[PDB]
Curated annotation (Swiss-Prot):
Positions of disulphide bridges: none
Superkingdom: Eukaryota
Organism expressing this protein natively: Homo sapiens
Tissue: Isoform 5 is widely expressed in normal tissues and is expressed at increased levels in T-leukemic cell lines.
From-to range in the entire protein, with total length: 451 to 511 of 815
Protein name: RNA-binding protein 5
Subunit structure: Component of the spliceosome A complex (also known as the prespliceosome). Appears to dissociate from the spliceosome upon formation of the spliceosome B complex (also known as the precatalytic spliceosome), in which the heterotrimeric U4/U6.U5 snRNPs are bound. Interacts with U2AF2; this interaction is direct. Also interacts with ACIN1, PRPF8, SFRS3, SNRPB, SNRPN, SNRNP70 and SNRNP200; these interactions may be indirect.
Protein family according to the UniProt entry: Belongs to the RBM5/RBM10 family.
Length: 64
């Protein structure tokens, strides 16, 4: 690792709040950030995800 930063920690300060939708648009990955729940919304699979700093990936927030 170290010399291969593929997926860093996303900062929702680089996001675009879509007022019409009510979500923060994530151009980084292509997801929707819910400001209230603080989770990521996959608009294709309609699922919720969160960023894990260790796995460097988005894991389903609905632990099931």
């Amino acid at each position: 690792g170290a010399m291969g930063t593929k997926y860093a920690v996303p900062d929702t300060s680089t996001y675009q709040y879509d007022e019409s939708s009510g979500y923060y648009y994530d151009p980084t990955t292509g997801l929707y950030y819910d400001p209230n729940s603080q989770y990521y919304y996959n608009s294709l699979t309609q699922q919720y995800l969160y960023w894990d700093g260790e796995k460097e990936t988005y894991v389903p927030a609905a632990e099931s």
